[PDB]
Amino acid sequence: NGRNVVVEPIYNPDTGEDISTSLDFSYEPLYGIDRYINKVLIAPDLYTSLININTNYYSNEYYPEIIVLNPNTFHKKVNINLDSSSFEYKWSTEGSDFILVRYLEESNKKILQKIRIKGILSNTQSFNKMSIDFKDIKKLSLGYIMSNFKSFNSENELDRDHLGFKIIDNKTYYYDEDSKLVKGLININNSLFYFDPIEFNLVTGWQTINGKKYYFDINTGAALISYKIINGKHFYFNNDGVMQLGVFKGPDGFEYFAPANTQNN
Amino acid sequence: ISKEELIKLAYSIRPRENEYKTILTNLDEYNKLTTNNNENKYLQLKKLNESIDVFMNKYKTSSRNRALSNLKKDILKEVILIKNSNTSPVEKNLHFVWIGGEVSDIALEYIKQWADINAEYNIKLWYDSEAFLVNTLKKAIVESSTTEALQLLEEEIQNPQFDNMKFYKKRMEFIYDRQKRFINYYKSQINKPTVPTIDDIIKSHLVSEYNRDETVLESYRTNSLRKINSNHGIDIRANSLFTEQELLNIYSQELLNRGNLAAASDIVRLLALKNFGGVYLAVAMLPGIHSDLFKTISRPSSIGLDRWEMIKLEAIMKYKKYINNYTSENFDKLDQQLKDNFKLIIESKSEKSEIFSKLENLNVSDLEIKIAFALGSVINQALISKQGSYLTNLVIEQVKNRYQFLNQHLNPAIESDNNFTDTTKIFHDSLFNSATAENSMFLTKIAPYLQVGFMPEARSTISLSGPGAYASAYYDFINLQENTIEKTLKASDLIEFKFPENNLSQLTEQEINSLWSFDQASAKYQFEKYVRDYTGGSLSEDNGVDFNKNTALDKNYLLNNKIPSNNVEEAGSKNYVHYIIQLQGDDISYEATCNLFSKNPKNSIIIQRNMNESAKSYFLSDDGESILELNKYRIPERLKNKEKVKVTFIGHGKDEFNTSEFARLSVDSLSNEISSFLDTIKLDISPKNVEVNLLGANMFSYDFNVEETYPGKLLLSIMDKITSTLPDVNKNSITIGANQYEVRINSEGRKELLAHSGKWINKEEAIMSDLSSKEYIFFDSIDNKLKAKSKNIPGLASISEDIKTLLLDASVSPDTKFILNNLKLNIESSIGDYIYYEKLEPVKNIIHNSIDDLIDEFNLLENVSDELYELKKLNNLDEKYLISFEDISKNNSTYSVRFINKSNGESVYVETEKEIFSKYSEHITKEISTIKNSIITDVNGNLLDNIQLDHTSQVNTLNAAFFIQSLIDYSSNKDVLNDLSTSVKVQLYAQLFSTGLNTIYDSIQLV
């Protein structure tokens, strides 16, 4: 389905037993595998009037946006309970859904937690059903949030659905199958490519990944493999693309590829 | 409908509760109380719904709430089933309202046409005998207040940068003072033992406070009475319409306190339809036209549907006229064979016998009323009701509730005798301190109630007694509630309550003339007319240096003085090019083009069409500080990949409401200009969506009728050119748009405006009104008329926040504080209207489409479950029967489906002519064959799965697994009777393991 997490209430085995009316989400089980997950789709049920979203788990690196589906419960008001303060939120609107953004700066690390409530502006029944609880204030409304909180333009988000190389700016991306925007060191057809893991764009030139040295072509972006001439010097890589220090054979003959701080430095 | 099937369908571990027993007893009373009378049955169903609501509110985690919600949905079907029972025609009457003045000759011709076509229908015209001079009194008050305010503002008239809203505020203050004096004089003549009349009090006030003549006003009262009494007039005071003192007070405060004749006419409509059952039509309505007599004429694609309908009416009433001044300017367009075809096809028939339809059968229920439609919303034009109609009582109860709320929150400000500003501040402080979460939009709408009809952008009757009250009462009737204030209505329920189109036929020249509202452009042109009438020497502000000034592009001034001083920025995407075009040789458009180039110094080009030979494209290079004089209006290679184009024409427009010219061009001339410009674009850009702007003075955006406006016909011609010539741009990827002023931020941070004098003026309320009133009009994809785009809601919120900060500022005059408060109320009402009217589109991507696909699959699953349940009810098959889906062998007409018992396995056959259980069986066979080839082999009951690492082979198996798993696992509605879960489980087991269920026929192995 596109590597999307579907949070769902547990189906009750006993029919006569009382049905639970709460949903909880936390970023804790996404630790380590958040670099593969596209989005999170919380899907409430008929018996759901309370949603807790624990947004304080700060040890992750990538935070997927949360899309809250529109419920059709018999309850008068359904409750969203975020454990965060009333400030550091900017609201928006992309068509007919409500966008909430948590942007906070800490430890010289940027955290952008985005929450979207899908299909909530279509009619006043869905508009007046939601009531959002924070850490410092509680029992709000979407009209209160629109009147009080600061608004930002979310229409600048150019990264829509694509399928191949997009040169949408001076930068360039990949946009793989199911439009996931891959962000690491990946191979696509037969050659290794590198996309910078904090801005998602393709980077060229010299690169270092966990100490090892790779080289990526300026014209294309693929990892160089054979004995290649770079700026009048000579370098040798293996099939994996990493340079090797030692004695290896080129077309002109064997050569010596020394480490740094040597007789020639 | 389940008298005894509700039990053993909703089981809980706890025993039966008192509210559940009340629900069961009330349901049994409903089922055992069956009669042809519908009102008692409706009240019984409403009591049942209220009992279910209070039980589900009391007990939250009960296991019966799912079955009770399904019962609630069955109740919402049953109310439509109850209303569609008494198919009886309405009693034959027509009602028309004209209060306070002479009946116009055009409306007289319309009602005589209605009487001539419908001879068997007894028409009526309602009027007030004591109210005949209120229109003249209101006109005199408006003219006196205009003179009083304009004598005070005469020293500021001479400023060309004058703002109109302060003059309108002063005129509204004087109007409120005169109305307070008149109502004090009217309430001063109640304590006398003798009784006066309303027209006598109005005449006395007119001859005391004006130079009015008693004999002239007596003559005007007398001649107006005989015209109405000859033209089927019946008095509203002679009949027993006015019964309740609350409704008398409502009519008195909406006639004498406020000169609001349409609001008085609304309660007149409801009281007339409550007393005498009849069919109401407005005085600007025409009878319907048969579609068969005009279907031989093909409609052109360059003419909208409303334009085609009104030129059809103009073609009918052009030759056989029946109207003294029926304008046919839109009919007089160039179509010679269409005009000749219309002439022969209306001269080949008889006179008023087949051209216009008849009202010979209007079959409605006692509870039902029908109402006209206008752009997806109801409108109080055509009504059909019997005598004593229940939903008509609901509408008048909603009007009573809204007026009671308004009077309760207004009467402190009425009794507090102050001036207009303090009175409306007391009113606003009383309203906003009682604003809950359910009527915030309602209070924001009815907040500028005292200035309705006098100040621009003041619409309160729509929420008080008009289409908002009608839609609220429709919701209240359908969903079985009491006194809903403001909630939405489904389009399906609205078209189920829809008036017939061939009986309504709304489109009328008088209807189009009345469709315009008192907006910003109307207020500006009325102010200009007032100044031009009061002062003999009018001021010509359009002359300037406008002509004979072929100013070249100052490259040094553009590069060194404007782009480094660009203090503004945008937060939108940059995959577009800005084709900035200058159409006039003046410093105003030169500075406007320079400022737009400051807005976009990267992608924009400059084309000056004030001269012809020295016309090219100016833009920055790949490096900064370099401007190219490239000819042929071309673009660099960096701009050859953008998917959007944003053309912009900057010029002037003459002072005319709905101006037909821009920059001394016309619609067709500018369409040919854009076509000739597009002949050079086609070799560079193959875009996905286009966008046309229009900047310049006296260029506004209108929201009621987008046709007959300047962007409408231009939009139609340009969309024809786009869908003919430019590839990969769809019909719905079109956008027209008009803007009046120019926005610039200086080094301080303030927003600056450019006027005709060439200097920069901080007209903050004008620039905020322009930014909040700019719209975009596009062509909708359902093959309909032109629609308006949704505005930038965060942009409106930013404008409202800036208004809030400027109102919290200290050095701001109270008049501008009042104007900005009104603008904030208008912006909040606009956002509430976008929420309320369902004008916000859903988003479309890969993530959002799958959610809607599962929603549609669940709805289809519920429909199949309900139809299977009623089939099992009809054919008297018990719970032990399992339907087969692989055997949908059919006859020529009916569909035959077989059943398998779970105890002895016989194969009976039943016949039912339904398209469902054939395509659904095909779907559940295809989604089982999708996973059938995902299994390589079966070894001793263990299935060896085959995994596919291709992405497109993983979506199909996952979708099939979801589709099978949902309808094999989910407990559907009324699933204790029919077991569709095991009915598809047996089919899945048979197809996965053995030979299929269509082949297995032996009873023992079937069991």
UniProtKB/Swiss-Prot annotation, chain B:
Residues covered by the GT44 domain: 92-464
Region Glucosyltransferase region, residue ranges: 92-464
Region (Autoprocessing region): 540-798
Marked site positions, Cleavage: 539-540
Region (Four-helical bundle), start-end ranges: 1-87
Domain named Peptidase C80: residues: 566-773
Recorded phenotype for the gene knockout or disruption: Cells lacking tcdA display virulence and cytotoxicity, because of the presence of TcdB. Cells lacking both tcdA and tcdB display a strongly reduced virulence.
Binding positions (UDP-alpha-D-glucose): 97-99, 135, 265-269, 282-284, 514-516
Binding site for Mn(2+): 282, 284, 511
Protein name listed in UniProt: Toxin A
Underlying gene: tcdA
Range of the intact protein held here: 4 to 1010 of 2710
